[PDB]
Amino acid sequence: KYRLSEGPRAFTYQVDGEKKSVLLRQVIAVTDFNDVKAGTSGGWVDADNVLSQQGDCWIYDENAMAFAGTEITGNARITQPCTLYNNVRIGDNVWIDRADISDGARISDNVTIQSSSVREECAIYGDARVLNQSEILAIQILQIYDRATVNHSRIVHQVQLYGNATITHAFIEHRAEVFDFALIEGDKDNNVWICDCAKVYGHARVIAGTEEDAIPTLRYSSQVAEHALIEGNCVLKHHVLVGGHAEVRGGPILLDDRVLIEGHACIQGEILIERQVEISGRAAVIAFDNTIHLRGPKVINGEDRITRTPLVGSLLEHH
């Protein structure tokens, strides 16, 4: 499929703020294949094993770099200025565009990485799409697959994203997972933070608000699934489970220490819910532009309408 240019050339690239260079040879097609005509020059490599002679895989940009143990095979297309190095693997029908990939990252199947960067041991396969300035820093390994779509987001550590999850402007850390039809939607003024072992799946939605720091924050192992929806300045900490067709908005809101919210429950405004509280049915907890504090053990259901802190039971007596 191709031959390497004769004269090697040095190319610079920076790693962790340091400037580094490598000697590479330019790939030159010696025959027609796919959308590549013989005689055309592509990217640069540091060994003939970097780019497979078989299949349709190819490096199109003359500023593209692939070296240090990286291996491109199959029909993988690498377009625009890219930098792949340190035992990276790209095969099948993968598409890499103006993105950087390094440190043993393995991109397979029909994946797309565009205007983004991926670093360290992780597995991005299936029909996953990582786009628009996303940053994937791996460090169980981090996986993004199925039809998950990541947009201008930062995925780190050992996060798992799959199913049809649609993430945008989010920061998912540690061992957080987002799958099924989950929608994580931050905006330019507020990201969405999902940390630790939190999980968002089913048809759940987590939507940042427009107010200053109205950052939806899912911590520890709290979850949001089924048809639940969380928006605005909301923080979920220890053992919180939001499901059913519940809706949480307003802020600031804090859910912590064994809180279960499902059914038709609507929770809106500055509300603090904690300590064994279960809300379902058609209950409404609304704090009109006001504050509400709910503490259990306590079951709120049926048509309970709460517009002020209830001065009874667990609110006035703990232990």
Added chain:
Amino acid sequence: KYRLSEGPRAFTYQVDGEKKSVLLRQVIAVTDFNDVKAGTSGGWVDADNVLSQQGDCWIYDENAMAFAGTEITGNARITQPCTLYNNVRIGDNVWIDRADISDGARISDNVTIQSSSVREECAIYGDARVLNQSEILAAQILQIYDRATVNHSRIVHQVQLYGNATITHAFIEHRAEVFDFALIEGDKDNNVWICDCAKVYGHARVIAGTEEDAIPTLRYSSQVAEHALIEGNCVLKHHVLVGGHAEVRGGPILLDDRVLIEGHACIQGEILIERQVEISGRAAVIAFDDNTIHLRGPKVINGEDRITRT
């Protein structure tokens, strides 16, 4: 169950900037039932047939009003100051909380109407929830049913909302329909606009943006389906459908005259797409902040097409 107070009082209510007055007698429990102890006074009516003697239905607030043909039956609960007039029908296990219902509205099953207003011939049934300052203003009638949720939205004319749709901060009008797992999400700076005969269904998502006038606007017969996501300043017009797993953002964007965007398509930036254009596959059409993109067909964009300019 209850008796009317012998002394009728005069109450006032606002009707289109007008000041109205009506004579109502107050309801008073004469026996115990559900959560109402005998002897407690409830709301006010203008007839004994307004509140059924059967079932648990009851008007709790002493400031609530229900007159002029309104009929409350079954176990319907009317709580807080409410105004129900002009042939309204409330029954079954419906819960109306601090809201005004008028002009022949029929609310059934397990619906919840809270801090909102409903007016005219329309049907709200199933397990629908109309909450937080929503305004329902109604050959077919406006219908809100199944598990549909409405938050601080304006639903007008003959709109249909059902399935597990979730509507917030939106203006849905005329004959638009939203269902399945559709998500219509506006914010306090921008609402979402759905008009004419537009339809949003499947797992579609239409999210308003944060910048001034970033109003997603669906007109004529445009549709958003399957897993498509539309955000920000985007306008969909004649014969337009966004589906698959397409994602349209940035702005301002305009789609018109037979345009189909699906597959994995990502449309981002100030882009004008029109006249028999199809975009799918893993195609990307991105107009980098300063730049603009104008696509006019017939034309097909797919595979790994990457358009950054016209």
